[PDB]
Design an enzyme around this catalytic site. Structure first.
Site, short mmCIF file in Angstrom:
data_model
loop_
_atom_site.label_atom_id
_atom_site.label_comp_id
_atom_site.label_asym_id
_atom_site.label_seq_id
_atom_site.Cartn_x
_atom_site.Cartn_y
_atom_site.Cartn_z
CG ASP A 25 -2.00 1.03 1.14
OD1 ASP A 25 -1.89 1.98 0.32
OD2 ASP A 25 -2.96 0.94 1.94
CB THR A 26 2.28 3.38 -2.67
OG1 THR A 26 1.07 3.61 -3.42
CG2 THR A 26 3.06 2.26 -3.30
N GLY A 27 -0.07 4.20 -0.35
CA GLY A 27 -0.76 5.31 0.27
C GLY A 27 -0.77 5.29 1.79
C1 LIG Z 1 -0.33 6.34 9.57
O1 LIG Z 1 -0.49 5.11 8.85
C2 LIG Z 1 -1.63 4.93 8.12
C3 LIG Z 1 -1.70 3.72 7.40
C4 LIG Z 1 -2.81 3.44 6.62
C5 LIG Z 1 -3.86 4.37 6.55
S1 LIG Z 1 -5.29 4.03 5.57
O2 LIG Z 1 -5.48 2.56 5.53
O3 LIG Z 1 -6.42 4.83 6.10
N1 LIG Z 1 -4.96 4.64 4.02
C6 LIG Z 1 -4.42 6.04 3.97
C7 LIG Z 1 -5.01 6.91 2.84
C8 LIG Z 1 -6.53 6.68 2.80
C9 LIG Z 1 -4.69 8.40 3.00
C10 LIG Z 1 -4.30 3.65 3.13
C11 LIG Z 1 -5.15 3.31 1.90
O4 LIG Z 1 -4.34 2.61 0.96
C12 LIG Z 1 -6.38 2.46 2.32
C13 LIG Z 1 -5.99 1.06 2.85
C14 LIG Z 1 -7.20 0.24 3.21
C15 LIG Z 1 -7.77 -0.66 2.30
C16 LIG Z 1 -8.90 -1.42 2.65
C17 LIG Z 1 -9.48 -1.27 3.91
C18 LIG Z 1 -8.92 -0.37 4.82
C19 LIG Z 1 -7.80 0.38 4.48
N2 LIG Z 1 -7.34 2.39 1.22
C20 LIG Z 1 -8.65 2.71 1.31
O5 LIG Z 1 -9.20 3.21 2.29
O6 LIG Z 1 -9.27 2.41 0.15
C21 LIG Z 1 -10.72 2.39 0.10
C22 LIG Z 1 -11.13 3.74 -0.49
C23 LIG Z 1 -10.99 3.76 -2.02
C24 LIG Z 1 -11.68 2.50 -2.53
C25 LIG Z 1 -13.06 2.29 -1.81
C26 LIG Z 1 -12.76 1.08 -0.93
C27 LIG Z 1 -13.01 -0.39 -1.15
O7 LIG Z 1 -12.10 -0.97 -0.18
C28 LIG Z 1 -10.87 -0.18 -0.08
C29 LIG Z 1 -9.68 -0.93 -0.66
C30 LIG Z 1 -11.22 1.15 -0.76
O8 LIG Z 1 -10.82 1.37 -2.12
C31 LIG Z 1 -3.80 5.57 7.27
C32 LIG Z 1 -2.68 5.85 8.06
#
Ligand SMILES: COc1ccc(S(=O)(=O)N(CC(C)C)C[C@@H](O)[C@H](Cc2ccccc2)NC(=O)O[C@H]2CC[C@@H]3C[C@H]4CO[C@@H](C)[C@@]42O3)cc1
Ligand SMILES: [Cl-]
Ligand SMILES: [Cl-]
Lengths: 99, 99
Positions: A25-27
């Site tokens: 997860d690069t984000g």
């Molecule tokens: C300080 O350290 C950290 C580490 C991680 C996070 S973090 O986790 O809040 N975040 C950060 C970013 C949102 C800014 C990382 C980001 O990659 C996050 C990871 C993820 C993936 C699945 C479930 C939970 C988290 N992705 C996501 O929210 O995606 C969503 C939104 C876009 C689409 C709609 C959804 C369907 O299901 C997911 C895959 C989604 O894809 C924050 C702080």
């Protein structure tokens, strides 16, 4: 390896003697793993994303095997819906984004 | 380019004539942008992240330039803390993860 992004970039990780699947997860600044038991002291931390904040336990100096590559760093443990390998460990295995 | 991950992978995007900063996010399925007005009709979508679910507006076939690369696709608009470029557009610009 070169991982295309047509599908979620899921890999197998080994942490605390257990095998888990996790998202590269690069984000994510930090690595966040679902509730498990790990040894050592921890401190509480609040992390925020889409939807708001969750409380996690911060463990330092944790060894984790990512797709067969050993790395060490901080791991956050809490009620995350998916195991997330963040930048703090992606750098240690030499991962880059290319386009 | 080749982007290492010691810093957040932020790029400039151009959408609706405005320059914005956005995170290249392999852990995001879809692309999520902060509140703005975009053309056309929208559809509702519910997306879940680390801290719960938010309601977003789905716009299709939106033109967006990502670090100078043109993409045309679906953008979700809502209360996200940062603009996120997800896999739906990363695949259009040919991005891969390498280690
Ligand atoms: C300080 O350290 C950290 C580490 C991680 C996070 S973090 O986790 O809040 N975040 C950060 C970013 C949102 C800014 C990382 C980001 O990659 C996050 C990871 C993820 C993936 C699945 C479930 C939970 C988290 N992705 C996501 O929210 O995606 C969503 C939104 C876009 C689409 C709609 C959804 C369907 O299901 C997911 C895959 C989604 O894809 C924050 C702080
Ligand atoms: Cl670390
Ligand atoms: Cl490097």
């Amino acid at each position: 390896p070169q991982i295309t992004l047509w599908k979620r970039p899921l890999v197998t990780i080994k942490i605390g003697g257990q095998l888990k699947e996790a998202l590269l997860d690069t984000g994510a600044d930090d690595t966040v793993i679902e509730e498990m038991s790990l040894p050592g002291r921890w401190k509480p931390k609040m992390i925020g994303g889409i939807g708001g904040f969750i409380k996690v336990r911060q463990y330092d100096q944790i060894i984790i095997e990512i797709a067969g590559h050993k790395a060490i760093g901080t791991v956050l443990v809490g009620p995350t819906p998916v195991n997330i390998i963040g930048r703090n460990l992606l750098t240690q295995i030499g991962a880059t984004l290319n386009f």
